[PDB]
Amino acid sequence: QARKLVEQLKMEANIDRIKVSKAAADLMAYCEAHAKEDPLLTPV
Amino acid sequence: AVYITVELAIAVLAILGNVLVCWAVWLNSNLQNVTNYFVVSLAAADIAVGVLAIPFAITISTGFCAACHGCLFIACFVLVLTQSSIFSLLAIAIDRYIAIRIPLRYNGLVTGTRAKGIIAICWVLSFAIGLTPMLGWNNCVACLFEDVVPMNYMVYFNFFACVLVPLLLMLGVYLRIFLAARRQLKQMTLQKEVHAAKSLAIIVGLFALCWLPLHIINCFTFFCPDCSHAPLWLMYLAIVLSHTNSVVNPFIYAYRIREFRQTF
Amino acid sequence: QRNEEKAQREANKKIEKQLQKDKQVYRATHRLLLLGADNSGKSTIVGIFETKFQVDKVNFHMFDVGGQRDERRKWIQCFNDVTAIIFVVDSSDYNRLQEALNLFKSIWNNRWLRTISVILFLNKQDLLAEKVLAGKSKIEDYFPEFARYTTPEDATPEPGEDPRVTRAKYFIRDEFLRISTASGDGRHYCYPHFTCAVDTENARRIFNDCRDIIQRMHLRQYELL
Amino acid sequence: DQLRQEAEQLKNQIRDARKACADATLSQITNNIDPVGRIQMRTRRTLRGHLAKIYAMHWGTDSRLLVSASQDGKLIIWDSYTTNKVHAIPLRSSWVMTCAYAPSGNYVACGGLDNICSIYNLKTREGNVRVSRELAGHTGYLSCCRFLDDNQIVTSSGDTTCALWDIETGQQTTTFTGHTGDVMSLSLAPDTRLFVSGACDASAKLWDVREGMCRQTFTGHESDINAICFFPNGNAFATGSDDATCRLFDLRADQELMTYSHDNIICGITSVSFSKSGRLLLAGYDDFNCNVWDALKADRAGVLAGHDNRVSCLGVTDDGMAVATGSWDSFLKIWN
Amino acid sequence: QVQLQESGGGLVQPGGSLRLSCAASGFTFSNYKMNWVRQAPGKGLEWVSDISQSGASISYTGSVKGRFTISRDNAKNTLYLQMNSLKPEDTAVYYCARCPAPFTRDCFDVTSTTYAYRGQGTQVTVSS
Ligand SMILES: CCNC(=O)[C@H]1O[C@@H](n2cnc3c(N)ncnc32)[C@H](O)[C@@H]1O
Numbered sequence: 001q002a003r004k005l006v007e008q009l010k011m012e013a014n015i016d017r018i019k020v021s022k023a024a025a026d027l028m029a030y031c032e033a034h035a036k037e038d039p040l041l042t043p044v
Numbered sequence: 045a046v047y048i049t050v051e052l053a054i055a056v057l058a059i060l061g062n063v064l065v066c067w068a069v070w071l072n073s074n075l076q077n078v079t080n081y082f083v084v085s086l087a088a089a090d091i092a093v094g095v096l097a098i099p100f101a102i103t104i105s106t107g108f109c110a111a112c113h114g115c116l117f118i119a120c121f122v123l124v125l126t127q128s129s130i131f132s133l134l135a136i137a138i139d140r141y142i143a144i145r146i147p148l149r150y151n152g153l154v155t156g157t158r159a160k161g162i163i164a165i166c167w168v169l170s171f172a173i174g175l176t177p178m179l180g181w182n183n184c185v186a187c188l189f190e191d192v193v194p195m196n197y198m199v200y201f202n203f204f205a206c207v208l209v210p211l212l213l214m215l216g217v218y219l220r221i222f223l224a225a226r227r228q229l230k231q232m233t234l235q236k237e238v239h240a241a242k243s244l245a246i247i248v249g250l251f252a253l254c255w256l257p258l259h260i261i262n263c264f265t266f267f268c269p270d271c272s273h274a275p276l277w278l279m280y281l282a283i284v285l286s287h288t289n290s291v292v293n294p295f296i297y298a299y300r301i302r303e304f305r306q307t308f
Numbered sequence: 309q310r311n312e313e314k315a316q317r318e319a320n321k322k323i324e325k326q327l328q329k330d331k332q333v334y335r336a337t338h339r340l341l342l343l344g345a346d347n348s349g350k351s352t353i354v355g356i357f358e359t360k361f362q363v364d365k366v367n368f369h370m371f372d373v374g375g376q377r378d379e380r381r382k383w384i385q386c387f388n389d390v391t392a393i394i395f396v397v398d399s400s401d402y403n404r405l406q407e408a409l410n411l412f413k414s415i416w417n418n419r420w421l422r423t424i425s426v427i428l429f430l431n432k433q434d435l436l437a438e439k440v441l442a443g444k445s446k447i448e449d450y451f452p453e454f455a456r457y458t459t460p461e462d463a464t465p466e467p468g469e470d471p472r473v474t475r476a477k478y479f480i481r482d483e484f485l486r487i488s489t490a491s492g493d494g495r496h497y498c499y500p501h502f503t504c505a506v507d508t509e510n511a512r513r514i515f516n517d518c519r520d521i522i523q524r525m526h527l528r529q530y531e532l533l
Numbered sequence: 534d535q536l537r538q539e540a541e542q543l544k545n546q547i548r549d550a551r552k553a554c555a556d557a558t559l560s561q562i563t564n565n566i567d568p569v570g571r572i573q574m575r576t577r578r579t580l581r582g583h584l585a586k587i588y589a590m591h592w593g594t595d596s597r598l599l600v601s602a603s604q605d606g607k608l609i610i611w612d613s614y615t616t617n618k619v620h621a622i623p624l625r626s627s628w629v630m631t632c633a634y635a636p637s638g639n640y641v642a643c644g645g646l647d648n649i650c651s652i653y654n655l656k657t658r659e660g661n662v663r664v665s666r667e668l669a670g671h672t673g674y675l676s677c678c679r680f681l682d683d684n685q686i687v688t689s690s691g692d693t694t695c696a697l698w699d700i701e702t703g704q705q706t707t708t709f710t711g712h713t714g715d716v717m718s719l720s721l722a723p724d725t726r727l728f729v730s731g732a733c734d735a736s737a738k739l740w741d742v743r744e745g746m747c748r749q750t751f752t753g754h755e756s757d758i759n760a761i762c763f764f765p766n767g768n769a770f771a772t773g774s775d776d777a778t779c780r781l782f783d784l785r786a787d788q789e790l791m792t793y794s795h796d797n798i799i800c801g802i803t804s805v806s807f808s809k810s811g812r813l814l815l816a817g818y819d820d821f822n823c824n825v826w827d828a829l830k831a832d833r834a835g836v837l838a839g840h841d842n843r844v845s846c847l848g849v850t851d852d853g854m855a856v857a858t859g860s861w862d863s864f865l866k867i868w869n
Numbered sequence: 870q871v872q873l874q875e876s877g878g879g880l881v882q883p884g885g886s887l888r889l890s891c892a893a894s895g896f897t898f899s900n901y902k903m904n905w906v907r908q909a910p911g912k913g914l915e916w917v918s919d920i921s922q923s924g925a926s927i928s929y930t931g932s933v934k935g936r937f938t939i940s941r942d943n944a945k946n947t948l949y950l951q952m953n954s955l956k957p958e959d960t961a962v963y964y965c966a967r968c969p970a971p972f973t974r975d976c977f978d979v980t981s982t983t984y985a986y987r988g989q990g991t992q993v994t995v996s997s
Contacts, residue, residue, distance in 0.1 A: 002536035008711060012749045013657035013856070017554040018785040023768075024559045027790075027811065028566065030766050031829055034810040039853045041569055041812055043869065073841040073862045079529070133423045140530065147522040148366045148515070152336030221532070228524060241533050259332060300531050316617060323618035327582060327607065328622075334584050334605050357647075358626075375648060376673045376691055377985070379715050381969050381977040382733060382757065383646055383674045383691060386628050388861075389585050389604060402953065403915070406930055410916045417974040419819075451931040484764070537989065544870055693983055713985040733969070734985035735871050752870045755896030756970055756986075775970045776896070799972045 047105055047280035051098050054287045058094035061294030062087040068298070068307035075303045078151075083297050084138045085163040086132040089125070095289040097125040101283065108185045115187035116177065122173045123193070124174030127206050129290055131166040134210040136297060141217045144224045172204060195266040203259045210240060211252060218244040247296050254289035258282035312523060333367075338518060340370040341387040341395050341424075343380075347407060349397035349431030350374075352505040363515055370394070383435040392518050396429040396503075399436040401478055402450040404522045413487045416498075425521040426488075427514055430480055433502040437469075440476040454479055477502060497524065547750075551788040559781070559791040563830045569812060572825055572835040577855065578616045580865035582609055585842030587859035588645070589677075593634040594787050596850040602632035602643050602858050603850075609656070610641065613855055613867050622653055633682040640665060640700075642686060650688050650712045652700055666700040666864045677718045681725050681742065689716035695730050697742060707745040711738055718760045723767045731758030737782060753780045753789030760804045760847075764828075765811040773802025779816050779826065793826045795833055804846045809853025817844035825857055839866050871895040871985060873948075873965050878991025883957055889950040891965030891988060893962035897948035900971035905939065905950050906979055906987070914979050917963070918950070921974070934960070955995050964990040 038044055065087045069080045101122045104115075122265045139162070181197045225240040259284055261274050274282070298304050344350030350372065359370040376383055387393065393415065397408040412428075415421050430436075439445060443517075447454040457479055465474045481500045488498035499517040503510055527533045583603040590601035598619055602608050606627035608808035610620040621757035626647035633642040644650040650668040657663050673691025680686050685699045685706065695716055714733035721728045731737045735754040738747050756775035763770050769783045769790070770814065777800055780792040793814060800819035807814055807828065814826040815837075823844050837844070844860030849856050855869040874892040881887045889905075904919035916940045918929040927939055938951040948965045966987040968976035978984055 002540055004816050005540050006536060006543060008747060008750070009547060011746065012547060013543065013550070015749055015787055016785065017787050018553055018763065018783075019557075020555050020559065020783070020786050020788075020790060021557040021562060023543045023783045023786040024557065024562050024790060027559075027764065027766070027769060028563055028829060030723065032763065034567075035812060037809060037853070039810040039812065040574065040856060040869065041572070041808070041809045041810060073864060121422070143472075143526045144523060147519050147526065148338065148364075149336070150526075152332075152366075155332060155335075191502075224523060225527060225533055226521065232494070232533070236533060243530075243532055263526070268346060301529060302531060303529075313615070316612075316619065319714070320618040323621045324582075327584075327609075328620070330605070331584050331606065334744075362843055370672065377693075377715070377981070377983075379691070379733070379977065380979050382676075382759075382976075383715060385631075386588070386604060386630065386646065407916060410976075410979070414975040414977055419973065419975075449932065452567060452934045453825075453931075548870065713983055715983075736985070752895075755900075777971070801970065853921065 045105070045280060046277060047284060048102055050280070050284040051102055051287060054284060054291055055094045055098035057291040058090050058098075058287075058294075061291060061298075062094065064308060065294050065298040065304065066091070068304050072303065072307050075301075075307065078154060078156050079139070079164065081159045082132075082136045083301070086129065086136060086293055086297065089129040089132050089167075090290045090293050092125050095292075096150075097122050098287065101126075101287070104189045105280070105283070110185065110187050112184045113190065116184055116192040118187070119189050119193050120174055120177050120239065123202075124171055126286070126290075127169035127174050128167055129257070129293065130206060130210050131170050132163070133289075133293065135162055135166050137214045137217050137247075140251055141221065145222055145231050145268070173202070176201070190265075195262060196261070198262045199266045201214070203262065207255050207259055211248075211255075214251060215248050218248050222295055229232040239291065243300070250282060250292050250296055251289065254286055254292070258286045324509070327428070328487065334511060337367045337369050338391045339387070339389065340368060340392055340427075340514070340518075341373070341384075341390045342394040342396065342448050343373050343384075344396035344431075345404065345411075348396055348401065348408070348470070349503070349505060350396050352431065353396060353412070353429065353503070353510045361511065363511055366515070368511075368514075383419050384415070384418070388423065390424060392425050392427050392514070392521055393421065394427045394429065394514065396431050398432050399430045399441050400432045402445060405480070406450070409483055412484055416487050416491065422493075423495050425517075425524075426498050427517045428484055428498050428500045429503045429510065429513075430500060431503050431505075433477065434504045434506070436480075437473045440473050441470065447479070451479070451483070453483075457482065494528075497521070544659045551786070554716075554786055555788060560831050566828050566829060568830055568832060569825075569834045572813070574825070574835065574837065574856070574868040577867045577869050578613070580609075580611050580616060580867065581863070582618065583607060583863040583865070584619075585863060586842065586861035587845060587863055587865060588629060589631045589845075590848050590857060590859040590865065592848045592850050593638050593736055594851050595638055595757050596852040596854060598634070598638070599848065599857055599865075600632050600634050600643075601846070601865055602629040603863060604628055604643075605702070608641070608643050608653070611865065613857070620655065620662055624666075625649070625651060629676060631677045633678045633680055633686075635683055637683050638654050640680065642678040642680065644668075644678060644756060646674045646763070648673060648692075650674055650675050650686065652686065653711075666703050668698050668700070668703070668705075670698075671703050673715060676716055677730075677767070679721045679728070680720055681721065687719060687721065687742070689719045689730055689732075691715040693732075695719060695740060695779055697745075707742070709740045709745070709747070711747045711750070712736075714757070717758060720761045720763045720770060722763055723765070729761050729762040729763065729770050731774070733757040733783065735774065735776075737761060737770070737772050739784060749784075749787055750793055751782045751787075751789070753782065753792070757799065759802060760817075762806045764807055765809060771805045771807065771814055771816075773805040773816050775801035777801055777817045777818075779805060779814065781814075781828065791828075791831055793831050795824070798824070802856075803844060804848075806847050806849040806856075808849060808856075815847055815849065815856060817847040817858060819843050820858075823847060837868065840864065871878075873967065873986070875963065875965055875988045875991040878963065878993045880994045880996065881955055881987050883955060883997050884957055886951070886953045887955060887996055888964075889991065889993070891948040891950075893902065893948060893965075893967070896967075897971070898941075899943040902968040902974065902976060903939075903941055903948045904966055904968065904976065904978065905948075906964045906966045907959075907993075908964070908990070909958075909961045912961075914981075915933035916979055919976070920948075922972075926974075931946045950972060952993075955993075957995050957997075959993070960995045961993060962990040963993050964988055 584605035587603045606624045608622040628646040630645040648671045652665040654665040671690040676703040677689040696705045697707040712732040719730040736752040752775045758774045760773040781791040804817040814828040817823040825835035840860035846859040876890045927991040940949045
């Protein structure tokens with residue numbers, strides 16, 4: 001349990017932690033791109 | 045006269061009350077059910093009273109020259125549609141009754157298909173009894189109620205089957221519901237008991253308040269007319285108060301169900 | 309194309325017909341969540357999950373919850389259409405009876421199980437009487453309120469039942485019904501019963517209990533109690 | 534003692550690493566852009582049919598037919614455009630907490646307290662619906678199922694473990710162990726290479742399908758994560774929970790970028806889903822309503838008023854034209 | 870990360886006293902019903918005592934009724950248990966355990982190990 005949880009968090013430690021400003025801007029820009037893409041927002 | 049103003053007010057009150065109840069069932073999910081169709085069938089009759097049994101009842105009080113078949117058809121059709129309110133009123137009492145004495149088998153015994161069937165029994169039997177004067181039992185011109193409709197029909201067959209039987213059934217049925225309420229409440233006592241008795245007394249008492257006054261005058265008129273007839277205003281009081289059932293039927297049933305309160 | 313839209317619609321009428329036939333049998337049948345504990349007379353009254361039984365022209369559908377694991381906050385939510393939760397408990401097991409009292413308080417005060425009545429079965433009543441008359445494991449140690457608790461006046465024990473056992477019998481109820489009365493609502497009522505494995509007539513006790521619940525449900529609908 | 538101390542230090546180091554990544558906040562940078570504004574989705578139709586409470590539902594890839602499981606034991610295959618019964622399948626166990634439509638539009642899944650994700654074949658040459666394969670290999674209640682393809686299906690359960698299954702073989706191929714409490718929901722990615730899963734330990738986990746291991750463990754919830762759904766791009770996901778808030782977790786950033794919270798709301802979320810745009814985070818709540826959240830700025834754009842009892846499930850179409858909300862009063866209402 | 874850290878706990882003579890203190894973190898402490906769960910040597914877990922969100926509707930187990938005293942600090946986010954007159958039977962691993970849902974009065978804790986809203990626990994021991 002402890003060794004498996006340690007090995008889990010050891011694997012979880014090494015990861016490409018991107019910036020929130022860049023991560024937010026990509027998710028924000030994705031909406032702006034697909035906002036026109038006939039969604040629930042502007043009813044057809 | 046005072047009857048014409050009072051009845052047309054009773055019409056507008058009956059529609060305003062009845063549609064609002066019918067609107068509430070259609071809007072909400074928990075309301076619409078087997079129980080709702082019995083309440084809405086009473087309310088639907090109340091709508092029918094508001095549009096079809098008030099203005100056609102107004103025409104009988106005037107005394108206008110017409111054919112004897114044409115005049116009698118109006119007075120009988122007024123009786124039919126007012127009678128459908130009473131049979132639907134009894135049908136709800138039996139619907140509540142069978143839900144309390146047979147609780148576990150209620151949804152098996154009583155269903156939505158059979159609910160329409162019981163509503164169909166009430167409306168068809170209301171048409172059957174009220175159109176009895178059309179074929180047989182009619183002494184048949186100045187279009188009056190007492191002339192065209194015979195008083196032997198009104199006391200023996202009509203008052204017994206269409207009013208007194210509902211009264212004797214409901215009064216006995218709701219006493220048995222109170223016995224079940226007494227059996228349940230003391231287990232779960234005076235304040236809640238008198239509330240339960242008074243609640244069913246409001247349901248039965250307003251039914252007895254509305255219909256009896258007119259029919260006891262018919263029992264008076266039929267049994268012995270040595271004394272004079274009830275004055276026009278006194279007859280108008282009895283006719284309006286009998287129609288006032290259709291105004292208070294929305295109150296005595298639809299107002300009491302807790303789910304209808306939130307919608308209204 | 310024109311045939312295809314109506315063809316599925318006429319086929320959906322049969323689906324509706326099968327569904328409406330299913331609604332008739334389902335609405336008539338009553339579901340019951342019989343949950344209990346490890347060695348607490350759960351298997352005696354009913355190790356099957358589902359148990360259908362016809363009593364007095366009324367089909368029941370009593371569902372045990374044994375196969376799944378003890379974390380019961382997200383699978384117990386599945387039983388709020390249920391008519392009555394048959395909560396069975398071991399009367400003799402004093403250490404683990406406190407866990408059942410906590411389990412009762414959780415079931416009673418849950419939002420989704422707020423509308424549900426609990427047909428309580430205090431199982432192992434004759435086996436409780438064996439432990440109480442011996443007096444080895446005192447009730448006062450595991451429940452200090454018992455030492456200052458007298459017998460109820462409205463209590464009705466069976467013939468040849470000792471007042472010593474009667475005190476212990478109606479005290480176990482007290483802690484369960486203290487939680488029952490603490491709601492202050494009246495949406496659901498606890499129905500306590502003193503039961504053993506040998507005492508066969510328990511489905512009759514459920515029948516009379518479930519009668520009063522759905523009676524209460526109808527009376528409450530009309531604002532009459 | 535030494536292993537427990539090292540495990541605690543790893544959790545502190547993981548939070549400290551992602552804290553450095555948090556330069557800005559999502560709500561802070563999305564304040565400048567204009568919101569969706571006043572949004573008021575009317576009910577298109579009302580799918581009345583189910584007898585008991587509807588626990589789960591899911592759309593197909595076609596964006597027309599939708600399946601929904603109810604506790605009476607029926608798994609009705611609806612048609613949104615025509616509000617009619619395509620199929621009505623009687624289950625083995627009446628209690629069913631999930632159901633899913635296959636991407637091909639051939640198979641349909643369902644399961645609950647029976648501990649079996651029962652797969653049903655729609656396109657049967659004989660005539661009636663038939664049980665394709667019973668996937669009985671879980672200790673506890675089945676909480677969610679999602680088809681990768683017709684060949685294989687991923688599962689969550691009440692045995693503290695998710696699991697990949699292959700219906701052709703009829704046994705679990707890859708197991709997913711890691712959660713502390715029982716898992717409640719899961720969501721596949723657009724690519725179907727990895728999937729997420731929220732559980733009653735209040736910590737979501739990203740699992741890789743091919744490898745069979747947790748990539749990273751997310752934690753930004755106080756109570757049980759009931760539901761979970763992927764963001765359209767596949768780089769983030771939202772999670773409804775019993776703490777009465779939703780939390781967006783970026784897979785790249787590896788932390789809670791945003792919390793969707795209203796202090797007036799005091800009850801948990803049952804289901805969550807995004808639109809095609811990834812703007813309207815549609816979350817279904819316990820208080821008989823569903824709040825239309827703005828995924829951009831974290832503000833309540835609208836609300837879904839309708840149902841008597843709680844909204845249990847919420848699905849969105851693949852084309853993004855319609856939305857459905859199954860509820861405990863048994864009326865599936867479709868909105869667009 | 871929804872952790873509860875049990876401070877205090879240790880050895881003490883029979884008849885004495887020992888004040889446990891559980892440091893809570895990772896969530897809004899005031900919104901949840903709190904309780905203590907103990908695990909004796911070679912035994913299953915059992916409920917000891919609970920406390921409401923406001924800190925009013927308090928309850929105890931009969932074995933610990935009058936002797937133990939539960940309390941909570943909603944501001945700094947922590948739970949207490951001032952144990953007095955400790956008997957030999959009271960020896961157990963006392964876990965402080967928050968209830969699963971907020972804004973409520975129901976709890977389905979006392980789980981077979983698997984319950985995330987509960988700490989690692991402190992070994993309270995009684996010997997003479
Ligand atoms: C079902 C019973 N219906 C009636 O009594 C209705 O018939 C009419 N009616 C019956 N008897 C008389 C009468 N003697 N005079 C006037 N109207 C009457 C009233 O308008 C009542 O509304």
